[PDB]
Amino acid sequence: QVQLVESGGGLIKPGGSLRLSCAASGFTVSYESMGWVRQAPGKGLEWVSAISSSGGSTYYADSVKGRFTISRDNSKNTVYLQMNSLRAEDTAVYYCVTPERQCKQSTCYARPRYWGQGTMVTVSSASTKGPSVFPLAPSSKSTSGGTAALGCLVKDYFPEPVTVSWNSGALTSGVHTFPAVLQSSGLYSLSSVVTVPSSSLGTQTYICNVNHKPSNTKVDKKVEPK
Amino acid sequence: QVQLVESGGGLIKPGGSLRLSCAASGFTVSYESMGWVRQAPGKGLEWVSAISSSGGSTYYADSVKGRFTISRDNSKNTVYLQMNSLRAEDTAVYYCVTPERQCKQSTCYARPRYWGQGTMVTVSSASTKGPSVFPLAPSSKSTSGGTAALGCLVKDYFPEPVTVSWNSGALTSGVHTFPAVLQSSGLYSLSSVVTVPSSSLGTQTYICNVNHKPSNTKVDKKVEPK
Amino acid sequence: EVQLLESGGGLVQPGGSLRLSCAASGFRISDEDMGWVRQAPGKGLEWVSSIYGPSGSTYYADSVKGRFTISRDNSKNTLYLQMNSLRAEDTAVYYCASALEPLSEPLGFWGQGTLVTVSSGQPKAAPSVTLFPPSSEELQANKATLVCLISDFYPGAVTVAWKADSSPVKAGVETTTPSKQSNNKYAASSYLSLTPEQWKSHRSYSCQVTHEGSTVEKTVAPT
Amino acid sequence: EVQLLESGGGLVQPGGSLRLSCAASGFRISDEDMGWVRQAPGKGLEWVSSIYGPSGSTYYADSVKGRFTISRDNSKNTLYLQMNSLRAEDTAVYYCASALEPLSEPLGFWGQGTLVTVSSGQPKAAPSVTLFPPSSEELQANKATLVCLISDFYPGAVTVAWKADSSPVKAGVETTTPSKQSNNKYAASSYLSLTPEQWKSHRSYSCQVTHEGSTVEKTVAPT
């Protein structure tokens, strides 16, 4: 298990092109078969392409053929994955594993396995957009002890990041501003909850501060009971 | 075991191009992986290229990569093997076998196997040349019974065919004009022996008639004892 | 279609042991050279063990030889991976992987992948779950989103199930992968996109999250 | 380098049986799915049988099922093919073939291929061999060619070995594949290209042809 340096991910719109690569940094790789594995968010792993040691034999997955091209420059200890006409189905994290072959040999058993860090490829037709902030109101059930959780939903913004705070940073105890999710629209969305004493509910007023400077926009939005 | 029609062999000079193909004649092939096997004269079999069922994954042998290209039109039930920059190392008979995969399935076990007839690809830098006829003289040992075998060697002619006879077709009992051999010069060569009563040796005179009409040339050459 | 479903794995203190299972369906594990690969952030996918056909010859990474054991049970069609003397560096998501058969419909086949965690100072933790119905300001804006927020669970692995009334739901489900918190527990979100018609045409909606199999859930209704 | 050397095969009358052997070197026959393919003029290369890994599941062409048997002997590292109840259509050159491992140095591996002949009215036939030294007209023309002519042998399979004095020779050997004669026996030629220096610098040259292992040979010398 020896690491290769992986490069060439990033963001693009559908139909665009990106190139990934893995190279050896300061050493010479024992040339052998190489493959690329990707994992879409929330889904399992899948092989997208493989190339033989000499670089002459190439596999491609059916949802990938024609658009992708694997290659390698053994003089540079580098394998490439040229991706063209990218679609939203290609948004995933791509890895640089070496395949597991039918070995039958003491040379295929103890061959060095090479791995890449894993770069994110994002294919989105969206761009800069301010967020839509919705109040996640407290519930009908408020014990005069504590147990009062309110939040605010930050929907359909682009791109990362967004800074969330409560009452202009006054309130800080107990907030969980969750990581954002990418949805089928290409936009991001997250929410930020606090849990707060219920005796202050109705007397203390809570507003969450939701900055998206990529679009130069905040929202401070109340979370009052219905 | 079901036959495909194979086409596209023949002769060419080094650096040229030829295209082989196998198609289904009157039926639709259950699409699966396909490969090409060749056999150089006097040598064993070897795989030159393979292609997956969908046509997206292609193998190539190392002595073949870059110059050859396998492909398939499943709408036409046809697989192709485009061969470019042909060399003398490519002179062989090419077959259209289906590969034997790691099956693990009741579908890969009883899958229909497809075969091609086997076409000859000849890469020769030679062209029309008359033959050089050498006498294969009888031996020091002649029993007055029979046992006298003489012949004439037909060397370095191009191309096939050559017609051999003895004494202008007078002598016909016991002649074996062997099939021709292709050598590392690109030219053909064969020999034709008769075995003849030894009592006629020294009194009867034998000349073999060696026509190569492709070059418009015969030779009638004696086979006398030394 | 063939499938490889994984079971086993969990939380263990240094020195403990686990056994991962890989249920083979549609084929037998003996003719096919299976292997295990682990996934860790910044470590990519690294092969740790693989079995090579009937001869029983096995490959192990140098860091797991003498501790891990690959094995097949053909009477149960299962690939096993015994993991003894576990250390902190063994913490990763372990995937069941097969031989790669490159001329086939897909190339390789993968298991779902189960989390294996090895730590000492951190105990088990059940997740805190609160479910929010779509806000009135959002439903008045022509769209509806159910927000299920999960926090304070260890180890960092959960699976979320959404259910209209009682039938499981298919589409519009977006759940992030668990993320470490400040108290070194984990958090995760689960959103269910929804058009205002289906929200008002259903008696209830529920977000089932299970951590170590732990069905914790919440139910909301327009009423 | 791994190798697959074939033995067995020969001539048999309808109803007889044979066993072909495939000696595996550099690997074990169990992890690798081997098969047999037969070669006949106008019939190309057709797979007749193949064994699929430890499960012992086997494929047979419809024309050989119930007659042929594929088998592995791992204590001897040999792939066998028993061929019972042979018919005339079974006559072909049978090649030992392995699984195809397409990401490897070569793709597939082949045995040398032994001839299997099934006929009734034709008996065995040893070959007639006559060897001709280079003619004087040819040596005066700066080149030399030894001509070895083989005729009247059945079945149609021979292997020719050329020998300078006693050491086997490498280059300039051109031997045609056997061809059917008028009396339905077979004929073959073997030429040895030679520069006049080596012909006069050697005590003798010999052409060894073996049919059914049958060493028949001739020796010529410049003297």
Residue numbers in the entry:
A (entry chain B), B (entry chain B): 1 to 226
C (entry chain A), D (entry chain A): 1 to 223
Provide passages from the article that reported this PDB entry:
Additionally, since these molecules were symmetrically constructed using autonomous VH domains, no special cognate chain pairing was required.
One of the best performing single VH domains, Gr3, showed greater than 90% monomeric purity by SEC, high Tms indictive of thermostability and a sub-nM binding affinity for its target, Her2. While these nine phage- and HcAb transgenic mouse-derived VH domains showed stable interactions with their target antigen, characterized by nM or sub-nM KDs, two domains, 3D3 targeting Luks PV and HEL4 targeting lysozyme, were unable to bind their targets. While we did not assess the capacity to rescue binding through alternate antigen or VH presentations, both 3D3 and Hel4 displayed favorable purity and thermostability as monovalent sVH. Previous work had shown that HEL4 contains a unique feature—a rotated framework tryptophan—that improved both the solubility and stability of HEL4 VH domain and may be implicated in the favorable pairing of HEL4 with the less stable Gr3. More specifically, with its framework tryptophan no longer surface exposed, HEL4 may display a more attractive interaction interface for other VH domains including Gr3. This observation suggests that although VH domains grafted onto the IgG scaffold do not chain pair as do traditional VH and VL domains, paired VH domains do interact, as shown in Figure 6, and the VH–VH interface plays an important stabilizing role for the molecule.
